[PDB]
């Protein structure tokens, strides 16, 4: 999945992405609201890029069992959820 | 499940309550933090009581497909989540 450089403002649904292994969202300057429980079906997600985006908080991601890359550079994230440590 | 009139302060874990049909937490004066996804396994919770408790927010409830009673009296909930309307 790749929606880079889009003007996305709201990401409110919860996708059925069981097979997704790569997700990019670089250069979304207005995307700041994300649905809690967005990553429930993303167990196989390996690359996640919320870079250059306007989110201040990230949905909990205990279901991201296989994630290996996670970039949040140039974003307004103020605290990183405790689920990441597991 | 009934833990009413207790001095519970934190409810963070997500239980495995598949068969549960009742949750009672009346008169918990200090319980104010509840982790999101707490009601994930409550696919059959029919009665849910958070009364005389100190919560100001409620976890996501998309999995409450069969809930028929929900009491939140005497609690500091300031806004009610949009997932309730479905």
């Amino acid at each position: 999945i790749s929606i880079m450089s889009n003007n996305i403002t709201e990401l409110s649904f919860s996708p059925k992405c069981k097979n997704v292994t790569t997700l990019l969202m670089q250069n979304n300057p207005n995307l700041n609201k994300m649905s809690y429980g967005f990553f429930r079906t993303m167990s196989s997600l390996k690359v996640l890029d919320l870079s250059h985006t306007a989110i201040t908080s990230l949905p909990e991601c205990d279901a991201l069992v296989a994630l290996e890359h996670l970039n949040l550079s140039h974003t307004h994230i103020m605290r990183l959820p405790e689920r990441l440590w597991l």
Side-chain angles (χ1 to χ4, degrees), chain A residues 10-18 34-42 59-60:
Chain A
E10 170 180 45
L11 190 53
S12 57
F13 49 84
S14 288
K16 324 312 201 263
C17 296
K18 180 62 56 64
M34 281 195 68
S35 66
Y36 251 60
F38 188 79
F39 299 145
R40 294 221 201 271
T41 40
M42 311 275 198
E60 73 282 331

Side-chain angles (χ1 to χ4, degrees), chain A residues 1-71:
Chain A
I1 317 291
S2 210
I3 48 193
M4 330 186 42
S5 35
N6 287 314
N7 315 317
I8 304 297
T9 55
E10 170 180 45
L11 190 53
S12 57
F13 49 84
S14 288
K16 324 312 201 263
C17 296
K18 180 62 56 64
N19 292 288
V20 156
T21 68
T22 283
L23 207 87
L24 284 296
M25 256 89 78
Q26 282 94 358
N27 299 66
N28 290 144
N30 311 316
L31 178 153
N32 50 27
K33 59 180 61 62
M34 281 195 68
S35 66
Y36 251 60
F38 188 79
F39 299 145
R40 294 221 201 271
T41 40
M42 311 275 198
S43 62
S44 54
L45 178 65
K46 286 205 154 283
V47 186
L48 180 70
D49 288 47
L50 293 324
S51 165
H52 284 59
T53 197
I55 57 170
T56 58
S57 94
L58 166 89
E60 73 282 331
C61 63
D62 54 11
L64 300 193
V65 294
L67 183 137
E68 287 183 49
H69 183 296
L70 191 129
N71 171 26

